[PDB]
Structure 1
Amino acid sequence: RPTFYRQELNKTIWEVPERYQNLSPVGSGAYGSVCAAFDTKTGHRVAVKKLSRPFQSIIHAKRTYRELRLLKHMKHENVIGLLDVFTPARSLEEFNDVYLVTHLMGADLNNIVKCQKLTDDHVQFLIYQILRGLKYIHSADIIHRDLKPSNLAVNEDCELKILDFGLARHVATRWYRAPEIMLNWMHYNQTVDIWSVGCIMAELLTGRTLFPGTDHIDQLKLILRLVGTPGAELLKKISSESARNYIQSLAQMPKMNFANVFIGANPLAVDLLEKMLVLDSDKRITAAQALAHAYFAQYHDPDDEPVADPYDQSFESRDLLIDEWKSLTYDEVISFVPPPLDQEEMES
């Protein structure tokens, strides 16, 4: 067991192994509090995330366990991978905090979009990497649920990683969210993530948020203006008569021609955007289909787009006591094994 030390940053107490020095805040959010640090054992900068009140309620306890299970499973070049997991607790009875460590990226995608106007080639490589990491996530029967520029970060080579997963089941921008999430549809497709990819791609191409809604209804207002009011084939799938009547009451909006909306973009990029930003989720392109789209011809390698090991998420169906959730999390902390050092990291 390493020696821990305590330190206050922007009003939150941090207790970490001595290996981690130079703690500086990165951000404070609903996910948790996040610091940058220098890992004196590896010589790399890391991001450290302290779970906020992990066992305050059944919901929070399950959500803590969910996040740790998820992150322990993720081993892919374009997905956040866990370098370390620790708690200052010496015993399960003392167990009340969880810290998660990953490599510190250079910049998130809000900062790249504000820093430069990306070339088409850059947009290809960034979106390709998101879809590559997404193929992996969907292959484990996971929906990310919260792809957005601040959950996407890159290094000096524009190598990209998908970060924090959406932990809601059954503060946080709406701008990249699939309309069916906002409307309580309840049996979501993995293609909610594909909707979010399309919103991101649009923004990378234009420099501007595609759908910057002011609130929940505005968000859907802006979506329907671009993709149109729902077609007959989609209306067939909506049980509620009152819901259909309200839609039929709207000013009927046609789908806009994306070639005109994104005028100047690579026609292949526009074609791919049309296949992502479809209202009907059954008709959105999948991550694996999108990687085979001609827009990615320069980067697509069918033999280097790996899939995930099966992911046992039978826990999602459990209703357990808070003490069991806390206990199962603690077992996961204890059993964690750090990945190996890279080959490039060692010499002769």
Structure 2
Amino acid sequence: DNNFYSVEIGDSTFTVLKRYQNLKPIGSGAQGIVCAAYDAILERNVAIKKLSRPFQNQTHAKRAYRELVLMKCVNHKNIIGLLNVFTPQKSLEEFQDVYIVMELMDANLCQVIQMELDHERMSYLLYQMLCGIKHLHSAGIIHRDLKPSNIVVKSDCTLKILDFGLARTAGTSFMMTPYVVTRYYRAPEVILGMGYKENVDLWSVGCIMGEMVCHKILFPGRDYIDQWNKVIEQLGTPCPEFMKKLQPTVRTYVENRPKYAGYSFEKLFPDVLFPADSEHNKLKASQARDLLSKMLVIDASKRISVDEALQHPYINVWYDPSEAEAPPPKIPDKQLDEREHTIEEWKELIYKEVMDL
């Protein structure tokens, strides 16, 4: 009668359908622990994420709703693919946990970052990453949380983006970015509390690319004031026109910082960190550097877009319209707009999403 068995994985208990066998842990984050499993019906490995009592408070609820809604919309080879959504509880009153089942990838990007990548692999991985982002951007979705723990790869050299809990739909209203633990990849506009467009995500690609080359985090900060200082030290105090856009108190503190000059991008990414220079006229160290100097730009109105990035010669060698000009996700009549509902109401919203589609 009972279609669920309950595995123990350290602290947390997974109660999952019988079809998913031999669960084992593969990763973790703010939302708990992720397991690999064998799906006896599809006869392949999958990934299984558990959201426990996500309706328990505001920030967990908004994050879960966004995840469910957007996992159902996305459809692209470089976005993690949704496979199943279920909950073991049988009614709304009893509802506790949501389980998301996804295709299984071999590792997240933190593993790749320590090793030395040649130019072919470095540019191909970024291209795939940019294609994933363009797909989100082609329906107005801004991810806001790109970072290496949110990108996964397979040993066949494919790459997929995941974790849309912070993703935002389109709108002309300011939305404060939710708190997160790993903040090293946030763009200046997010740090400083300014309005922002989709190429906040491009700044994050900039940090990731710098890391794949440095094998070290570009802007490590205990604090936000710490983090801003790392940015200006390395890139330089921004132009006075960029200072006007700031609110007064944020403005006074940023203008009172010591005026750093910033280093060149040759001084920031010398040939030594880059592999042997290809004979291919586009996969140069000088081209990867050029692309970095256009992504790692403090003032977003001066910063390259995802589309221009895909046309850049370091990336452009792999260009295929079936990947970079693919059909968008279909964003339903639901606003992921950081509104507030109460505990009782979030519970219904999240339950309906699990049971409907």
Distance in structure 2 (CA, Å) of the matches to 1:179 and 1:315:
23
Distance in structure 1 (CA, Å) of the matches to 2:286 and 2:327:
29
1:259 maps onto 2:259 in alignment: no
Amino acid at match of 2:343: I
Residues 132-211 of structure 1: pairs in structure 2 closer than 5 A = 132-167=131-166, 170=176, 172-185=181-194, 187-211=195-219
| Residue of structure 2 in register with 1:279 after alignment | 298
Percent identity over the alignment is 48
Runs (5+) with no aligned partner, structure 2: 168-174, 275-284
Q: C-alpha displacement at 1:317, in angstroms?
A: 6.1
Amino acid at match of 1:268: Q
Partner-residue secondary structure (3-state), 1:304: helix
Tell whether the 8 Å contact from 1:275 to 1:285 is kept in structure 2 after alignment.
Answer: yes
Q: C-alpha displacement at 1:307, in angstroms?
A: 4.2
Q: C-alpha displacement at 1:102, in angstroms?
A: 0.7
Distance in structure 2 (CA, Å) of the matches to 1:2 and 1:175:
45
Distance in structure 1 (CA, Å) of the matches to 2:54 and 2:61:
6
Q: C-alpha displacement at 1:147, in angstroms?
A: 0.9
Distance in structure 2 (CA, Å) of the matches to 1:118 and 1:2:
49
Amino acid at match of 2:191: M
Number of aligned residue pairs:
333
Q: C-alpha displacement at 1:138, in angstroms?
A: 1.1
Q: C-alpha displacement at 1:237, in angstroms?
A: 1.7
Residues 221-236 of structure 1: pairs in structure 2 closer than 5 A = 221-236=229-244
Q: 1:285 to 1:315 in 2, by over 3 A?
A: closer
| Residue of structure 1 in register with 2:228 after alignment | 220
Partner-residue secondary structure (3-state), 2:349: helix
Q: C-alpha displacement at 1:297, in angstroms?
A: 2.5
Q: C-alpha displacement at 1:248, in angstroms?
A: 2.9
**Could you tell which deviates more after superposition, 31-40 or 303-312?**
303-312
RMSD: 2.1
Q: 1:297 to 1:100 in 2, by over 3 A?
A: same
Amino acid at match of 1:145: R
In the superposition, the TM-score normalised over structure 2's length comes to 0.87
Measured against aligned partners, the alpha-carbon deviations of 1:168-212 in whole angstroms (never above 9, x if no partner) come to 863721221212222222x22211111110010011122222222
Distance in structure 2 (CA, Å) of the matches to 1:176 and 1:320:
29
Distance in structure 1 (CA, Å) of the matches to 2:58 and 2:111:
36
Q: 2:329 aligns with which of 298, 309, 333?
A: 309
Distance in structure 1 (CA, Å) of the matches to 2:205 and 2:319:
17
Partner-residue secondary structure (3-state), 1:230: coil
Amino acid at match of 1:17: L
Amino acid at match of 2:183: R
**Could you tell which deviates more after superposition, 207-216 or 67-76?**
207-216
**Could you tell which deviates more after superposition, 165-174 or 280-289?**
165-174
| Residue of structure 1 in register with 2:355 after alignment | 334
Q: C-alpha displacement at 1:303, in angstroms?
A: 4.4
| Residue of structure 2 in register with 1:248 after alignment | 255
Partner-residue secondary structure (3-state), 1:246: helix
Amino acid at match of 2:212: L
In the superposition, the TM-score normalised over structure 1's length comes to 0.89
Measured against aligned partners, the alpha-carbon deviations of 1:86-133 in whole angstroms (never above 9, x if no partner) come to 10012222222100011111111111122x311111110111111000
Distance in structure 1 (CA, Å) of the matches to 2:75 and 2:240:
42
Tell whether the 8 Å contact from 1:2 to 1:17 is kept in structure 2 after alignment.
Answer: no
**Could you tell which deviates more after superposition, 323-332 or 189-198?**
323-332
